[PDB]
Amino acid sequence: KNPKSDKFKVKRFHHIEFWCGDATNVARRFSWGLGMRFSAKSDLSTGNMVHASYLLTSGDLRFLFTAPYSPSLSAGEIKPTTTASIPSFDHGSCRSFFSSHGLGVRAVAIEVEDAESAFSISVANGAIPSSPPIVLNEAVTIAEVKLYGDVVLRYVSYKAEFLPGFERVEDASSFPLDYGIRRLDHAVGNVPELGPALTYVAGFTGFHQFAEFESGLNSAVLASNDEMVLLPINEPVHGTKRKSQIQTYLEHNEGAGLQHLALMSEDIFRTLREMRKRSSIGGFDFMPSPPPTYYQNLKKRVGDVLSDDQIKECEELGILVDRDDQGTLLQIFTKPLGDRPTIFIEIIQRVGCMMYQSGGCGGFGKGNFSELFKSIEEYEK
Amino acid sequence: KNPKSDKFKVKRFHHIEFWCGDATNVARRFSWGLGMRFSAKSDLSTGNMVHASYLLTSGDLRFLFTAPYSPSLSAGEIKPTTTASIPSFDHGSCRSFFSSHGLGVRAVAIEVEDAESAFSISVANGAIPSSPPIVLNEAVTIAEVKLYGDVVLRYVSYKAEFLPGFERVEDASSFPLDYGIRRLDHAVGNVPELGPALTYVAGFTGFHQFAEFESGLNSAVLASNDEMVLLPINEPVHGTKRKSQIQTYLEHNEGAGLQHLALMSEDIFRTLREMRKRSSIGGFDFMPSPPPTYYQNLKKRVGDVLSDDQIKECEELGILVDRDDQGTLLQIFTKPLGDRPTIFIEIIQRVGCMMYQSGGCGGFGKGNFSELFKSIEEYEK
Numbered sequence: 227k228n229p230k231s232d233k234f235k236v237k238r239f240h241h242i243e244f245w246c247g248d249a250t251n252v253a254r255r256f257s258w259g260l261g262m263r264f265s266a267k268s269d270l271s272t273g274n275m276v277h278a279s280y281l282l283t284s285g286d287l288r289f290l291f292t293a294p295y296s297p298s299l300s301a302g303e304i305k306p307t308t309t310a311s312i313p314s315f316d317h318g319s320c321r322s323f324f325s326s327h328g329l330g331v332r333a334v335a336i337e338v339e340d341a342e343s344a345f346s347i348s349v350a351n352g353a354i355p356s357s358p359p360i361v362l363n364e365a366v367t368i369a370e371v372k373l374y375g376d377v378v379l380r381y382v383s384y385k386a387e388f389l390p391g392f393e394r395v396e397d398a399s400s401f402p403l404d405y406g407i408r409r410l411d412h413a414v415g416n417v418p419e420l421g422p423a424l425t426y427v428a429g430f431t432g433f434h435q436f437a438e439f440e441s442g443l444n445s446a447v448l449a450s451n452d453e454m455v456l457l458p459i460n461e462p463v464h465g466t467k468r469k470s471q472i473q474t475y476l477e478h479n480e481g482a483g484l485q486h487l488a489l490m491s492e493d494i495f496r497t498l499r500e501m502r503k504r505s506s507i508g509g510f511d512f513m514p515s516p517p518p519t520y521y522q523n524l525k526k527r528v529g530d531v532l533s534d535d536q537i538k539e540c541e542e543l544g545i546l547v548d549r550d551d552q553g554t555l556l557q558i559f560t561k562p563l564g565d566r567p568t569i570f571i572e573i574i575q576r577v578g579c580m581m582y583q584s585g586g587c588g589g590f591g592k593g594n595f596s597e598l599f600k601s602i603e604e605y606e607k
Numbered sequence: 608k609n610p611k612s613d614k615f616k617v618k619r620f621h622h623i624e625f626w627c628g629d630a631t632n633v634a635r636r637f638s639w640g641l642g643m644r645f646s647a648k649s650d651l652s653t654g655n656m657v658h659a660s661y662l663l664t665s666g667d668l669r670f671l672f673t674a675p676y677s678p679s680l681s682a683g684e685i686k687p688t689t690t691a692s693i694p695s696f697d698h699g700s701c702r703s704f705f706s707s708h709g710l711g712v713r714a715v716a717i718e719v720e721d722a723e724s725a726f727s728i729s730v731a732n733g734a735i736p737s738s739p740p741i742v743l744n745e746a747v748t749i750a751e752v753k754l755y756g757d758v759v760l761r762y763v764s765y766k767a768e769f770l771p772g773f774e775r776v777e778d779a780s781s782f783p784l785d786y787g788i789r790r791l792d793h794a795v796g797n798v799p800e801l802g803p804a805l806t807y808v809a810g811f812t813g814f815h816q817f818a819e820f821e822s823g824l825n826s827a828v829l830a831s832n833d834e835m836v837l838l839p840i841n842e843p844v845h846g847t848k849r850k851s852q853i854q855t856y857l858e859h860n861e862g863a864g865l866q867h868l869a870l871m872s873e874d875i876f877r878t879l880r881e882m883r884k885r886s887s888i889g890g891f892d893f894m895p896s897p898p899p900t901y902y903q904n905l906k907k908r909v910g911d912v913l914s915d916d917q918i919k920e921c922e923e924l925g926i927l928v929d930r931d932d933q934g935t936l937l938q939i940f941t942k943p944l945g946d947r948p949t950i951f952i953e954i955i956q957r958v959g960c961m962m963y964q965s966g967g968c969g970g971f972g973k974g975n976f977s978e979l980f981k982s983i984e985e986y987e988k
């Protein structure tokens with residue numbers, strides 16, 4: 227059931243912003259590790275004396291990496307005279323965010339029709355305001371409300387190239403890397419109580435619960451009208467024999483925050499081959515591969531969607547497979563992106579639900595918890 | 608003249624420690640960009656609840672990358688019961704260092720015979736103490752004194768594998784990268800006044816001034832007995848038509864600090880080829896290449912040390928060349944390693960002065976200031 231109760235026109239995921247200590251090194255690491263191009267910059271060389279911001283892009287996926295310069299460089303500025311390209315930025319907020327949480331996502335940004343109305347309706351509907359609507363060069367409007375923890379949901383809207391005050395990057399600095407990633411599929415929060423967090427966010431967006439099909443978590447998924455913006459949220463389940471990875475997250479992150487970004491690939495096999503070649507030379511590591519028992523059991527479950535040759539390719543790459551009543555889902559999880567066991571990345575590709583492809587086709591892989599538990603005990607035998 | 612006035616037995620450069628916001632991402636970036644192996648770790652998986660520390664090595668060059676975890680993880684610890692592998696670490700010091708300076712070098716570490724005596728003699732001779740001598744597992748002794756700004760000179764001494772509490776890294780995590788870098792040649796500080804900084808450091812080490820052969824700086828080089836530990840220091844020269852890059856550094860670094868690390872290569876041409884292939888895919892950028900006039904003038908100055916084929920290879924790679932009365936020096940400079948125009952890296956290789964090779968052979972390239980100025984105006988013509 228999809229009641230389509232969005233309280234404002236929501237278009238699509240626009241970008242994800244990481245708050246860093248050093249944006250250059252994180253961005254260069256992510257660029258190599260994920261196959262993303264350097265697309266835009268706002269920094270000293272563009273006149274920004276407040277923050278360094280570098281945009282990576284792969285298809286529709288836009289990763290923004292932002293760190294503060296010394297406050298001394300902008301001491302004589304006030305918000306009306308600021309050189310920052312992102313006026314919601316604040317030296318003390320960013321430094322407090324990073325010291326409290328380590329490297330992680332600050333903003334989940336979605337494009338809307340009118341960021342100012344989306345902000346007014348949102349706060350009128352219970353959203354805790356974070357940064358009011360400001361208009362950039364009479365061209366782009368941007369506003370922020372609190373999402374969970376210190377993560378903001380950021381509304382952006384264009385009258386008609388990333389933001390005013392950003393420059394496109396010189397082609398000699400911009401190497402055309404691409405491992406096949408194309409857009410953001412979902413962004414997942416970890417919170418200590420799912421109920422109040424669900425009620426809050428659904429409260430001010432009008433997003434509806436997305437329908438599904440005992441280890442770790444309870445979760446639930448909020449979604450926009452066409453279900454192209456997907457915001458799952460997890461909470462821990464305490465008492466479990468193995469400690470909740472949601473609870474571990476909350477402890478090391480110092481509270482609620484963004485758990486994982488799921489990145490849709492147009493060819494998950496080439497993406498994984500390319501990322502795995504680079505795991506030990508600057509890129510990203512992947513979680514331990516499931517036992518062969520997991521793949522000996524794949525034929526019985528998805529042997530109608532993938533060939534034996536494509537099944538054995540999943541085993542080579544450690545790809546996990548789950549299925550809905552409408553589609554099948556291929557997925558894999560990186561190890562944590564930074565020092566803390568907090569944020570990590572998921573690579574996915576969906577099969578089915580053509581009408582274009584409808585969002586969430588295949589679900590989010592919750593059944594794979596059961597499949598790996600069974601495969602793990604079966605492999606001991 | 609080398610009066611050999613070291614007040615304690617100084618062996619060699621041992622390691623350089625960067626204080627980071629996220630040690631994982633900086634270390635992975637530096638690993639790819641420079642060709643350094645993952646050699647040792649001290650982090651959550653080794654029992655360290657205070658900091659994440661990852662060691663990169665290439666030959667004798669040891670780069671250490673350290674960031675703090677949440678203080679909450681170690682709240683019940685006291686210094687006697689600490690799980691930190693580096694007992695001089697302090698959450699507040701590291702966070703203050705990084706917020707003030709951005710990414711940069713915290714510790715310049717040299718191996719000595721007895722770190723505890725080197726600390727006592729140093730402070731007895733004017734050194735501002737920073738962290739007193741502590742003995743690790745009855746095996747390694749380590750102590751720190753202030754060097755300049757917030758950079759400490761760190762003494763380490765072994766009775767007889769990096770430090771106690773570090774683990775060697777599993778070979779599947781440790782990809783054997785190597786672009787030919789082999790050791791640290793010199794580490795250079797920027798200070799607002801060279802005189803008092805020179806007097807201070809020479810004061811407590813006994814290091815002697817190293818003899819040389821109007822744009823930017825005055826500098827001078829302190830050196831240990833065998834001249835294998837080399838510590839140049841720069842100050843700005845104000846009034847210059849072009850602004851002093853030392854002054855720019857001090858402004859963006861919020862005070863004195865480490866300007867550049869010079870890394871000796873056993874084959875500078877292969878090092879540069881390998882680093883340049885990776886500049887735009889996660890590695891490091893290099894400063895703009897000198898004009899061809901600079902290389903048309905190389906034959907007249909060094910055409911007795913390098914072939915025409917090796918001269919044109921310098922032009923391909925943008926390598927600079929200078930010469931002493933005892934040796935010749937090949938060098939090149941990266942762009943800044945992080946967001947701020949502060950710390951950068953120099954790759955060098957020395958020719959001559961065989962006895963082994965004596966340190967500082969060829970000097971530090973000061974003549975190249977003049978050569979590029981002349982080449983720049985000659986190339987306009």
Ligand SMILES: Cc1c(C(=O)C2=C(O)CCCC2=O)ccc2c1c(=O)n(CCc1ccccc1)c(=O)n2C
Nearest residue numbers: 414445446458460471486559572590591592594595
């Ligand atoms: C995050 C994830 C998802 C996922 O995407 C996600 C959603 O989008 C919607 C809400 C529910 C949800 O979970 C799906 C399957 C996963 C995982 C996952 O994190 N893990 C790792 C576990 C683990 C941790 C610590 C130690 C050992 C194992 C899995 O095994 N599966 C199989």
Ligand SMILES: Cc1c(C(=O)C2=C(O)CCCC2=O)ccc2c1c(=O)n(CCc1ccccc1)c(=O)n2C
Nearest residue numbers: 795826827839841852867940953971972973975976
């Ligand atoms: C650091 C450096 C060295 C060097 O190693 C060093 C020492 O070890 C000992 C003390 C003196 C010293 O300097 C040698 C030559 C350099 C540079 C250098 O930094 N630069 C860049 C200038 C510049 C900046 C900003 C904008 C444009 C140009 C050079 O051109 N030369 C030619």
Ligand SMILES: [Co+2]
Nearest residue numbers: 414488572590
């Ligand atoms: Co997911």
Ligand SMILES: [Co+2]
Nearest residue numbers: 795869953971
């Ligand atoms: Co130098």
